[PDB]
Design a protein around this nucleic acid. Structure first.
Ligand SMILES: Nc1ncnc2c1ncn2[C@@H]1O[C@H](COP(=O)(O)OP(=O)(O)O)[C@@H](O)[C@H]1O
Ligand SMILES: Nc1ncnc2c1ncn2[C@@H]1O[C@H](COP(=O)(O)OP(=O)(O)O)[C@@H](O)[C@H]1O
Ligand SMILES: Nc1ncnc2c1ncn2[C@@H]1O[C@H](COP(=O)(O)OP(=O)(O)O)[C@@H](O)[C@H]1O
Ligand SMILES: Nc1ncnc2c1ncn2[C@@H]1O[C@H](COP(=O)(O)OP(=O)(O)O)[C@@H](O)[C@H]1O
Ligand code: ALF
Ligand code: ALF
Ligand code: ALF
Ligand code: ALF
Ligand SMILES: [Mg+2]
Ligand SMILES: [Mg+2]
Ligand SMILES: [Mg+2]
Ligand SMILES: [Mg+2]
Lengths: 413, 413, 413, 413
DNA sequence: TTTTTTTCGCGCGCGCGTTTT
DNA sequence: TTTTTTTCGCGCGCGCGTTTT
């Protein structure tokens, strides 16, 4: 691992200055690698979180929703929060000196405000975030936070936009913006060039021509990633096959809409199947997004050898729909040869097959291509076109604002 | 017919070097207390044996820590003044001692160990930890933890990072090796052992617990009743006592003595043939806290009991002091067909009836089940469930720390 | 009031000797008058009770069932008692030094044993009645305790008879028997003579001839008393009339057999109606058996001027049938021109009309006649015959036993 | 326009004889505190005024008993040693005093009066009760009783037959007359008064309580909120405070000071116009415990308040001691739109909102309702029921005792 | 069109509401 | 066929289980 001069300056900033900091940079600029270095070398008590389970594991932490007990759905400044933290969690949050959030680009502003409110409650303080110093890592030109149209309508009454920096807490505090400008994941200068111009919406037809060889390229080592969950399910079912399959049915109890069920209705597995854990269970040593391989199937237990070498015996898990109207019980596992691009953000691969024939988020195409260390390792189902790129001009405005104002956003303290 | 294993031999040879403290640990029934007695018999050192409970002390051949070291009740801080009122007999015994042996260390508070450190340094007029005495601790942190109330923990929390023996402040100035015995002797059934072990470490599954389904209401005075709660113990003892030929002995209280602080029975009810336990130590008369016997005669002021160890003892009334404001006088005996799980820790039985429908301590269910040599010898009032298992995550942290640092904890010398 | 030599000897016995005492004597021998004197002059803390509400008021106390929280129905030595005493009641019973029970002849043995068990519970003692000294007043040749045939069958498995002295506590303790032999209520020697021979079953036809003038004697001052509740209801309804009547209906909620309802189904009242309270409410100043006159009737309040001068506003009361299956709500009042002979025991009147054409209890005829200060004040509906007298030969045996054994019954201490 | 009644004149003339203590009592709003001020104005005696609560003391023109006599918290037994640390100013004031005036005596513990007795006898170097000072007590035993926890009562129960002021041991060596004021002035509606009176003495009926049906959710900053619970007070105060232009002042705690022992606000939140109350006495600066005012300015270290009495005061931070182990520093102010019923006792209002859905003290409901001059001025959150009434039977006994013994209690001199 | 929580538990006890230099 | 109970209450907190000369 190489410690660059940019990284050294940021280390010294964080040690000398308690202000919040946004550490940003293009795909594969070493942000998560540097995150882990910062903690190891800092003398501070650090807690690591991320918006998705996979990204959290990649950073060595847990989801924001788990750490802070955050409910699903949009949270307005007038909603009352249930403060039901255990004493271990209160103590952990009080002991914490540095809150580290990775992949900040996918964090909603009301999530950050909920964290602010919950930390101020835990600390019994009026200081933003309870006085904890916050260091955020990510790339706003990758995927934005997941919001449904109805949620955006509710939030639009209080928020001028749907990115983390729109949080109301940044009227009372702010952060420096620093950037890492050396690419490490890729080494080919022309591949990097097209990536960068996709990222900032300034790619030309001629530059995208470099990627013509991706589509239907002639070749279990290749990882599939898809824009759509429906595509993920088809690819996973194909790779699963019909040899030696066991089926495990969900048990639903009372109210539980089918579109709200967090798990598989009919979990179909075989020995050798690539799977992902859906839930966190620190007692059993597994966490949301951890990957492994099924090694045995029984009546009430599924055995999976995790990538980290641990063998785990999974039992069924019970979700609540809330006030407990209905519940559902099922093994917390799902097939995982294919994954969404949203879940892929943060990971690195040598060989990938991307399914981007229909993109619908800013940054989605950019994230998909930038997972791979080399150009030759990408296969595509479709020619790469400018129509796959969706600009978000509110991000141009944001960067223009802080870059012309001393690389700082929000209330100066 | 006592097997000396290779693990036991290595520990003997380790201890030879009178400069490194050692924690000898291992699962229930791995021969820990058996090996303690071997170490002493074969060592050339002057050894003293102690344990936190009277039953465990007798089982190890020693006395309670509170009796040996004159320890008061309630939390002791490093700033509390200790009464150093040892007789010359006791001072001489402690000066002659070369090896302090503590069994069932898991139930020893950290402030208890520090009080022992302070008292031994006073006796030895030394600044060396424990007065220079070598300390060998025996037990299993995954059995019952020390009994503490929330208020006592609150006082201690200003000085201690946790409430286990290894949190003692003396282990900033000294430390100990950790060694383990990994062969189970008490049980012989491999599948029974596997369920015990997986209950112990919080990773038992529903399917494994199905092995224990036959415990509840199993069809069969040979069975020993072991209960989570003292109130249940009292009910079972009164049933077995019956109403035939009962004699009652009332406590005499003199002045101030809260009823919740009385150490003995308020109304001691006995008959010839009753199974009883001594509550106090009187080495001159040959009886000790936790010793078991059978009532052979009842008189106005004398109860004759033939002890299990073959001695016949004539018990008279004993006088406790509450400090001197008030006192209470009563025979130091109590019924003992039934006992608490806390009192059972350390003992072995062939046939038991366990009352674990309500467990409230980590390790409580594990201790209860692991007393019995065979599965068939256990009867339960309730199905055994995961809700009976209570994790103590401070123990996971502790084992992770010492296992990665050479099986040693505390200040390296 | 005259203090006789018999009374003086009993006073000195009770002061010098903590043994229990049965104070007995014929009707109108001053027992209840002397009871009140004993308390006034004793230095002991005394509590007064009686089996019926009227008798309790006459003695200045409360019913045994209320004082000790006794359920209805027979209580066997194997039934478990609910010990649900308030702290005031526990303290009152602990403060009590002398338990005084009037009209003991109507107290069942299992009631006394329940009191024994409850007092031993309150005092945490094995001494009979918790060590309290018990002084009982009454006349075994008056009415016996009320028992139904089914209750007698249950009790006959444990009890050799159905009088208070058959209680099992009198195998562990006993009492002196003393007697008052001077009649005060009546002054006519020949009236006294016939009363006495009715009482002891040795009246002759010629002696009963003295009472011939009672039947249909030519004359609101006369009080009616009846053997049967049905007769009481008819006489009360006659005297109530149909002028200016208001009706108040019971509200029954769920399970409540009509033969188990403690109150009136359709309470019919008018201003001027003679009524009796059915329940105790010390807060409002009224108690079971207290007598008064209705002064006003409203929608939800009935106003009664009690004999003691207090004006009371009665609201509806709610009984429980038990575990609360059903309940009933009603004003705790009932008409009371007529009363049963059982309720009359203990009271004195100048003028009475007795309805004894059908008697069914030993002592019933004797109690009815002996309420009146003079012979001329009695009117009867029927000629007085030997068939109205029902001997209980178990009482002859009892008196023979104690009179020949030093006027003591039970275990001598 | 203050009416001097014949009852008041007789009490004035009674007191003239400086050798008989007097208890002046009467129902809520009978002019007791008004007459107190008259007695002093017209008496030629040197009078000192005190009360158990700060609000009541201000209402009577005096100071708290704890401040006047330097009384520690917690129960004081006759064997506890008192710190007699009075300044010469205080000693001289107490020596000059001729009449000790105590208002709201119902909330005064008996051990408090004995501490005052002991301290005055020390100051006067005398064995005469209260040092020979004449004591006149004002209050209503059917309002709130003194605040005691069960543990404090347990300690005191070894020496005291009850927990009201008249149980003080000094009343074995002295006594007092009881006089009463029986004309209500605060209210004028006879039917409203009748319901107040019948709630007060535990004899209100359902039909009488029907008069109060219109209280619940009555349609209307003029209304004062009075609550049973401090937690409710805090909620109402925060609502009225709002979130416009709020300044927060945090407590500074230094070392040992349990959070449940802090006398002030942890986070004092204020704005200009906020209704506040002083928490401490500083006679030099002209403010006293319970004095009410309005915030006029907020600064870093100074809050300017125009008091109700016309004085403008500049409050600085105050330092409490916990004994010296730890201390806490904070402005001695708290919001006071809402107040507890305990703090309201003694005050009069035209318009109130009472929160009595959960009452837990005798007299609490009565005090709440009786603050208001008219029925229409009361709004309630709940229907008024008999379950809100809590009898204290020790008061019935007390009134029975003194009323039958010449309206005098204690040792007659 | 895309993602995302929560460390054991039944039961009795009794606080609640006040107050210093 | 005849007589006879029980003094406020919702809610949070946390014990439980141990131990001297
Ligand atoms: N300082 C570095 N030295 C060497 N290789 C690096 C360095 N930083 C990143 N890399 C490589 O590039 C990859 C990018 O890591 P990561 O921080 O997860 O991506 P991003 O920079 O987009 O957050 C790493 O997996 C690593 O292989
Ligand atoms: N080396 C050995 N050979 C034979 N039996 C043994 C050996 N070690 C222990 N045991 C048996 O295993 C059981 C465990 O008893 P004990 O040592 O008191 O509990 P623990 O091992 O949990 O301290 C005892 O019955 C003992 O006889
Ligand atoms: N010692 C006495 N002196 C005068 N009159 C008495 C005396 N004892 C009883 N009486 C009269 O006789 C009546 C009997 O009283 P009581 O004791 O109730 O009846 P009993 O003696 O049957 O219990 C009293 O009401 C009273 O009028
Ligand atoms: N003699 C009087 N004449 C006129 N008003 C009076 C008289 N006595 C009391 N009041 C009024 O009755 C109300 C009762 O107030 P206060 O005396 O403080 O309460 P309490 O009487 O309960 O001590 C006050 O508003 C007071 O003005
Ligand atoms: F954090 Al990245 F690609 F932006 F792994
Ligand atoms: F650890 Al053991 F009996 F001493 F299980
Ligand atoms: F007690 Al009676 F007649 F026997 F009044
Ligand atoms: F007794 Al008051 F206001 F002083 F009701
Ligand atoms: Mg990253
Ligand atoms: Mg052992
Ligand atoms: Mg009588
Ligand atoms: Mg007043």
């Amino acid at each position: 691992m190489i410690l660059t001069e940019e990284m050294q300056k940021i280390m010294n900033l964080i040690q000398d200055d308690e202000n919040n900091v946004f550490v940003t940079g293009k795909a594969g600029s070493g942000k998560t690698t540097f995150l882990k270095y910062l903690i190891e070398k800092s003398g501070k008590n650090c807690i690591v979180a991320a918006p998705t389970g996979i990204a959290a594991i990649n950073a060595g932490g847990v989801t924001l929703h788990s750490l802070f007990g955050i409910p699903f759905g949009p949270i307005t400044p007038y909603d009352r929060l249930e403060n039901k933290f255990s004493e271990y969690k209160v103590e952990l949050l009080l002991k914490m000196e540095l809150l580290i959030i990775d992949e900040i680009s996918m964090v909603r502003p009301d999530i950050l405000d909920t964290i602010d409110r919950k930390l101020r409650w835990v600390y019994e303080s009026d200081e933003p975030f309870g006085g904890v110093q916050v260091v955020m890592f990510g790339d706003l030109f990758q995927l934005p936070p997941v919001t449904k149209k109805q949620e955006r309508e509710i939030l639009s009454d209080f928020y001028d936009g749907f990115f983390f920096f729109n949080a109301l807490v940044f009227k009372r505090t702010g952060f420096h913006i620093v950037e890492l400008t050396k690419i490490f994941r890729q080494t080919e200068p022309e591949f990097i060039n097209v990536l960068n111009n996709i990222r900032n919406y300034q790619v030309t037809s001629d530059e995208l021509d470099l990627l013509s060889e991706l589509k239907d390229r002639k070749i279990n080592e290749y990882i599939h990633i898809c824009t759509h969950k429906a595509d993920v399910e088809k690819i996973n079912a194909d790779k699963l096959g019909e040899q030696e399959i066991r089926n495990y049915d969900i048990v639903i109890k009372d109210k539980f809409p089918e579109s709200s069920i967090p798990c598989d209705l009919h979990l179909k597995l075989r020995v050798g199947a690539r799977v992902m854990s859906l839930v966190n269970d620190s007692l059993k040593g597994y966490y949301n997004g951890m990957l492994g391989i099924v090694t045995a199937l029984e009546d009430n237990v599924i055995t999976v050898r995790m990538d980290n070498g641990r063998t785990i015996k999974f039992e069924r898990y019970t979700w609540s729909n809330t006030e407990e109207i209905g519940s559902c019980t099922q093994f917390p596992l799902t097939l995982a040869w294919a994954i969404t691009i949203h879940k892929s953000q943060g990971l690195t691969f040598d060989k990938i097959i991307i399914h981007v024939s229909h993109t619908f988020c800013p940054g989605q195409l950019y994230v998909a291509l930038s997972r791979c260390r080399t150009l030759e390792g990408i296969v595509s189902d479709a020619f790469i076109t400018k129509q796959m790129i969706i600009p978000e001009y509110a991000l141009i405005d944001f960067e223009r604002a802080y870059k012309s104002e001393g690389n700082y956003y929000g209330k100066r303290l």
